[PDB]
Design a protein around this ligand. Structure first.
Ligand SMILES: Nc1ncnc2c1ncn2[C@@H]1O[C@H](COP(=O)(O)OP(=O)(O)OP(=O)(O)O)[C@@H](O)[C@H]1O
Ligand SMILES: Nc1ncnc2c1ncn2[C@@H]1O[C@H](COP(=O)(O)OP(=O)(O)OP(=O)(O)O)[C@@H](O)[C@H]1O
Ligand SMILES: Nc1ncnc2c1ncn2[C@@H]1O[C@H](COP(=O)(O)OP(=O)(O)O)[C@@H](O)[C@H]1O
Lengths: 51, 480, 501, 11, 478, 72
């Protein structure tokens, strides 16, 4: 009973850690996608402006 | 013909030529510069026109070196596209886009010729031939059955085994095939073309004792060439194959490596022609150029064309637009992954993302299709469970799940065959596996009766019999 | 709005307009940018012909536009005032090349920058000469003893191979290349170290370590500062390639090292942007791929008919943040005969040099090794990839088979024996005996850190005991059963002497 | 290939 | 008489000047444009000739405020390029970008001037002595030692301890090295340029009585000036150190803060000069722009220049184009992380991402380099384990792993060191530490003589005896 | 998802579709407890088994159309 209880506490803490880590990875992923879209539009309009 | 054009502006590979106001060459004609080298002898830099610039001026494309051309040179029109020799004459000679035999041999029969630029055949003249033919590689045989006369593209990165696989595929197919092959080098390593030249001279398919008995035509537009050369070498190789299927009317093999270098040459020359740039810097005429080169590789009721072409992916990102268009013109794709290439499984053809059109019950049979999709099922299950066992562990699963774990970690080894030409990179004798052997071995691996072998004893074996021999060898070496 | 209309050219042209004459003899200077000048006139110059300015500065006429010429400047053009005159020397960017450049620091102007004297070299050669074809080439079949046991054994560079040495910041790329140079002091090769855009103090450091270590007699250091213009940096590897191309045409074995090739790529991007040409991915022009191609396609081995003097390249590219998605590293990976990746996460982790064996590619393979090392290193890279890929999974499991654990111990000894120190290279016989005692399980009975301390003493053991090993390996060039019996006696006796110690 | 591995790590 | 000319265009910080058809100024010729103010004639606005547009006109970036500069005004060329005074008069004074005293003191000797666009010193003049230099920071003394005469870049994002660390490096080194130390202020707040001045006034480095022996020159092109000034203060400080080296033969310290603003000035002016847009937003002439500073900062046979500098990495991005070109122009890198500063580790020098050319056994011996490599190995083991540590925790490893985990968890606190500048911030006075005890303390942490006690003693202390006394003090008061 | 919704589902179709999507949502929420169905509650074990039955009912071969009779 005690080992199943301690494992339940460990699983709950892992789920909370995975929650926070998922939120941070989502923030960084949105930022990476935005910067990639901006870089694409910048280089496209620069190559077009050149001609 | 019989006119004179003036070079007016040379921005590297692009050329501005002016003509008399009446006589103007059509698009995709072939100029020929009566230039000279540093020694002053009259040397030619053949030239393809792409666009009427207006004000009796045109913009062109140089097929060779530009260093040595001055504003005030002369050029003569031929009134026709860049004609290339065709037929039994062009068999056993290195070829360039200019129709020049590059290997140190004599001239060629110049009277049999044909232009480069043509279109797809009549849609009502398409051969619905869907017959399978055996390759030999276990992954290439089972999980991706290849259409005879269908197009085949080997999507991969740089240095994962595209060229090795295509060279061993030539090695295995052209000797037992029933038609004349044609290999083209489009923007690749020159010494590797020399290695192919020597290795196929010695292996008799050149049969250089007597000319015109060779069954291959070698064309080479490799990396060190101006973008016109790589822009039209693929078209030249395809036109050779089109003669060999239109007048000699037989099956052919056409390996167009590397098609991404063709598209990249098009982009390098297109950004300079004033084209408003498309996605990341490729030309806007991307899909139409890719189709116009692709769609004339086809079968017909005169003779089908089998085409295993190597296609390159930048950074191993299949989203990129040149592979994004090349997926739209292929029958049975093959996606060599960096994961298996770094893991150690050679060939690194990924079993999962690879997917063909021939693998159907009514095209290959029911049990082949069934065992193939069951193999795909087990592997998809394992790569699903990977991110779970990454943190969970090997002792928090089921007997079904751990059973499929060990089975898939046997399968991913078993699909690795030591090729004939892989001897320098592996150190293993020659292996060529049969399709019946592969399906039988996968039923032996999947049906559970091999769950007691050493798990590392499945690596780089030809037959499942040789996997049993590896199990015996490993257990004998461990127990002494 | 359009150049060649500056109201002084217009009066010069309007004063005579019953004519179709040309002014091919001379040319005028209209604009001077930040190192790129626009020339009016010059109606006979080539695309690449050298142009001589009024002050006495030379330039190249790259963009041959219709009425005007856009000339890049081969020097810092602080003195070019507009309205001045130019010429055309008729020679297209030629440099003198002979056997007398050996051992000196050379500018991209092919003139010394260490003050040891003006060099004599009669026969001159284009700075850009085309690559050899296919009939002039033959397959790679020679060794190239790098000195570094890992690269020599598993990822073997050969004479004619053009191996990329890719990596990140401070990972040991220049160090590896300099070891590759310094090892060669008995093979009679002509190395060239072209340092593009490197820090000048670092150029002085590597050249004085060359002149002290002994390999100055071989080498040529074709290096400039960072404050050379973009034309000089863009042209310097072509000068190095020209020297090496002369030497391989003089049927001498060569080995050149570009350092780095991202600097030359961005220095080409400089003049491509300053000539108002369109930008591609990350503002590079699309033809940087063809640029590196027409540079790198020269290095090969020559055929039997042309002297067989090989040309070896070793380009170096640094990847910011450790990626392959960047355009220049992707290009250079595509062009070379495979790549050699180096990781900081291995370099700071005691593995020095940090060659990640799992992703390092040699496209020539074991056909560039002698039959001894080809025998012992049959499938050692591949079984090492297997050992790594099962050691990675052996962190997600608790208890394993003793069989897999013995295999893990042997693979750990295998990975441990190849840690070679910088400025401390090996020889072929050292490598073959070390790797033989490695893969044959003959180290799995001792400690992890005990392996290198064992193997250096075993190397010195065979050094002081058996010259027959040396002569069998070096005369016949194969690891045969006589030498193998000698080596097995060596294993037994050294294990005895360590059990005593 | 950046966004692909990013999305896959999220999953 | 000097050739006069009338401007034609003005688009913010860019002036387009026309000249008579015979005479057109050479590159970097100063162009004294007169102008008109409410109070007489201002005249202080000046231009540097960049390009030659043809049809008898040029384009020149204004070195001061460009307002008032009405179109159609006479501009007197100097004929010589932009030239500042230099010599004994500069020692102990705050100068402008144009070589002009702005600190409200006497007008200096205009006799020993020198142009700022002098070429790079020739490569043959290199002296190749490789001397270690401890400075008093644990990560600087141990991980990436500094080189007397080389360029030592400092990197860091927004407020991650760049200016604090360089003020501490000044505070330690400046009284020891008996050479002139020309601090440069390029692109930062005027508060810092005033506070360094006030500290050098009250301390006694800049003392009004006997100001000749002040052994410090200064220049401050702060964040209030047009991009031409922020683009040329670097070369101003560079020639003000170059003359001291080339004539006074002194070993010279150089400090710049922060040169990313000097690069950004060129990036901000290249879009106005009409030049094409390069990599992501920058100028095409970027690597040569960085070289034009850094390459003139090499030690020669005459004297030595040592150039500490903060190289700000924008948006906390480390592979931005300008730091990318900066990284190869150095002898040591020290990236100041945001994570370590966020958790309170101060200074926040990233240990395993900081490397010097001097961390080599032939230079720093076998003891120092061996111990430092082992410390970095432990830290990289910690960094590799950080994923599973963050998602899960601690118990799920073998104790052989947790040996290195706990050891690295103590080392990451022992790399912190209280500052003689940050003593006013947290509350712990500054503690200078030398290498001879740093190595011994790190050996003692590696071995396990002080491992069993909890790690929180090691945080923000000096010597290992300070760690022992702090461990005893925390085990005294409950 | 379809924003027209049940308006183009026939009366014989809508009731079984609602019950099917009920049980398929209750199967898609209890998916991760796959090998833990032995340790799950008996009712949730029936839910997982029946959801698996529904999902394997959902398969069909390619290009084999089924009329509304066969579907219902
Ligand atoms: N086997 C080794 N053992 C210990 N140190 C090594 C070893 N190999 C290389 N190093 C060290 O790594 C340091 C970095 O080497 P190097 O300067 O070649 O890296 P780099 O990234 O090529 O530098 P740059 O980016 O300036 O070209 C060298 O100073 C060298 O002392
Ligand atoms: N050793 C330290 N101890 C405590 N706090 C520190 C320390 N170093 C820096 N800080 C914090 O950082 C702030 C100042 O950082 P600093 O000015 O050195 O870098 P910066 O702001 O990036 O420089 P700049 O403004 O020139 O770019 C201080 O307010 C202080 O709170
Ligand atoms: N089937 C294979 N067997 C052994 N080695 C292989 C195999 N495929 C690839 N390799 C390794 O990959 C390299 C060859 O890749 P290659 O096909 O030349 O590159 P690309 O795939 O970019 O054309 C060699 O170094 C070789 O060691």
């Amino acid at each position: 009973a005690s080992e199943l209880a301690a494992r339940m506490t460990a699983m709950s803490n892992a789920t909370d850690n995975a929650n926070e880590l998922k939120k941070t990875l989502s923030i960084n992923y949105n930022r990476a996608r935005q910067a990639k879209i901006t870089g694409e539009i910048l280089e496209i309009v620069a190559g077009a402006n050149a001609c | 013909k019989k006119n004179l054009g003036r070079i007016a502006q040379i921005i590297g590979p692009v050329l501005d030529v002016a003509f008399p106001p009446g006589k103007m060459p059509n698009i995709y004609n072939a100029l020929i510069v009566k230039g000279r080298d540093t020694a002053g002898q009259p040397m030619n830099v053949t030239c393809e026109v792409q666009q009427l610039l207006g004000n009796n001026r045109v913009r062109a494309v140089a097929m060779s070196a530009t260093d040595g051309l001055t504003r005030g040179m002369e050029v003569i029109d031929t009134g026709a596209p860049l004609s290339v020799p065709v037929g039994g004459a062009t068999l056993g000679r290195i070829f360039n886009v200019l129709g020049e035999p590059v290997d140190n041999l004599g001239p060629v029969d110049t009277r049999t010729t044909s232009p480069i630029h043509r279109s797809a055949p009549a849609f009502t003249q398409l051969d619905t031939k869907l017959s399978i033919f055996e390759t030999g590689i276990k992954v290439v045989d089972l999980l991706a059955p290849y259409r005879r006369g269908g197009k085949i593209g080997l999507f991969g990165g740089a240095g994962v085994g595209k060229t090795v696989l295509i060279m061993e595929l030539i090695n295995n197919i052209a000797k037992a095939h029933g038609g004349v092959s044609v290999f083209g080098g489009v923007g690749e390593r020159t010494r590797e073309g020399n290695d192919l030249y020597m290795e196929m001279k010695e292996s008799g398919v050149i049969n250089e004792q007597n000319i015109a008995e060779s069954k291959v035509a070698l064309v080479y537009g490799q990396m060190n060439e101006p973008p016109g050369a790589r822009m039209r070498v693929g078209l030249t190789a395809l036109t050779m194959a089109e003669y060999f299927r239109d007048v000699n009317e037989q099956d052919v093999l056409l390996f167009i490596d590397n098609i991404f270098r063709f598209v990249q040459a098009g982009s390098e020359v297109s950004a300079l022609l004033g084209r408003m740039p498309s996605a990341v810097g490729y030309q806007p005429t991307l899909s139409t150029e890719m189709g116009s080169l692709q769609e004339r590789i086809t079968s017909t009721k005169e003779g089908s064309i089998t085409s295993i072409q190597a296609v390159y992916v930048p950074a191993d990102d299949l989203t990129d637009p040149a592979p994004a268009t090349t997926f739209a013109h292929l029958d049975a794709t093959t996606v060599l992954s960096r994961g298996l290439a770094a893991k150690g499984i050679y060939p690194a053809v990924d079993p999962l993302d690879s997917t063909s059109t021939m693998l159907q019950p009514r095209i290959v049979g029911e049990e082949h299709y069934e065992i193939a999709q069951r193999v795909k099922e087990t592997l998809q299950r394992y790569k699903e469970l990977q991110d779970i066992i990454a943190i969970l562990g090997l002792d928090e699963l089921s007997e079904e799940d751990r059973l499929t774990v060990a089975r898939a970690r046997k399968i991913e080894r078993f699909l690795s065959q030591p090729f004939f030409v892989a001897e320098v990179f592996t150190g293993s004798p020659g292996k060529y596996v049969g399709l019946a052997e592969t399906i039988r071995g996968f039923q032996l691996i999947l049906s559970g009766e091999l769950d007691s072998l050493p798990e590392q004893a499945f690596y780089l074996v030809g037959n499942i019999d040789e996997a049993t021999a590896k199990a015996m060898n490993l257990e004998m070496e461990s127990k002494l | 709005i359009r150049a060649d209309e500056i109201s002084k050219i217009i009066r010069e042209r309007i004063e005579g307009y019953n004519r179709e004459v040309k002014v091919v003899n001379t040319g005028t200077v209209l604009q001077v940018g930040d190192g790129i000048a626009r020339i009016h006139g010059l109606d006979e110059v080539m695309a690449g012909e050298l142009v001589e300015f009024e002050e006495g500065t030379i330039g190249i006429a790259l963009n041959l536009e219709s009425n005007n010429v856009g000339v890049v400047l081969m020097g810092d053009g602080l003195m070019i005032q507009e309205g001045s005159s130019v010429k055309a020397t008729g020679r297209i960017a030629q440099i003198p090349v002979s056997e007398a450049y050996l051992g000196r620091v050379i500018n991209a102007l092919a003139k010394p920058i260490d003050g040891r004297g003006e060099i004599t070299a009669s026969e001159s050669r284009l700075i850009e000469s085309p690559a050899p074809g296919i009939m002039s080439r033959r397959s790679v079949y020679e060794p190239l003893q790098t000195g570094l046991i890992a690269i020599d054994a598993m990822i073997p560079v050969g004479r004619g191979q053009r191996e990329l040495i890719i990596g990140d910041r401070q990972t040991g790329k220049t160090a590896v290349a300099t070891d590759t140079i310094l090892n060669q002091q008995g093979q009679n090769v002509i190395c060239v170290y072209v340092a593009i855009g490197q820090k000048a103090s670092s150029v002085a450091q590597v050249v004085t370590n060359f002149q002290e270590r002994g390999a100055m007699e071989y080498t040529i250091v074709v290096a400039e500062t960072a404050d050379s213009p973009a034309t000089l940096q863009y042209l310097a590897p072509y000068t190095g390639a020209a020297l090496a191309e002369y030497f391989m045409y003089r049927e001498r074995h060569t080995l050149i090292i570009y350092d780095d090739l991202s600097k030359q790529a961005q220095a080409y991007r400089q003049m491509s942007l300053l000539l108002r040409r369109p930008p591609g991915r990350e503002a590079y022009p699309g033809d940087v791929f063809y640029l590196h191609s027409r540079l790198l396609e020269r290095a090969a081995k020559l055929s039997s008919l042309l002297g067989e003097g090989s040309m070896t390249a070793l380009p170096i590219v640094e990847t910011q943040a450790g990626d392959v998605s960047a355009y220049i590293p992707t290009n250079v990976i595509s062009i070379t005969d495979g790549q050699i990746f180096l990781s900081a996460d291995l370099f700071n982790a005691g593995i020095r040099p940090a060659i990640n064996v799992g992703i390092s590619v040699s496209r020539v393979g074991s056909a560039a090794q002698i039959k001894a090392m080809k025998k012992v290193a049959g499938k050692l890279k591949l079984e090492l990839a297997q050992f790594a890929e099962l050691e990675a999974f052996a962190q997600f499991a608790s208890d394993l088979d003793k069989a897999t654990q013995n295999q893990l111990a042997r693979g750990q000894r295998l990975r441990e024996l190849l840690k070679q120190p910088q400025s401390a290279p090996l020889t072929v016989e050292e490598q073959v005996m070390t790797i033989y005692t490695g893969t044959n399980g003959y180290l799995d009975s001792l400690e992890l850190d005990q392996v290198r301390k064992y193997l250096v003493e075993l190397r010195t053991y065979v050094k002081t005991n058996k010259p027959e090993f040396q002569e069998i390996i070096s005369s016949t060039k194969t690891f045969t059963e006589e030498a193998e019996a000698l080596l097995k006696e060596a294993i037994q006796e050294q294990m005895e002497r360590f059990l005593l110690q | 290939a950046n966004l692909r591995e990013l999305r896959d790590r999220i999953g």
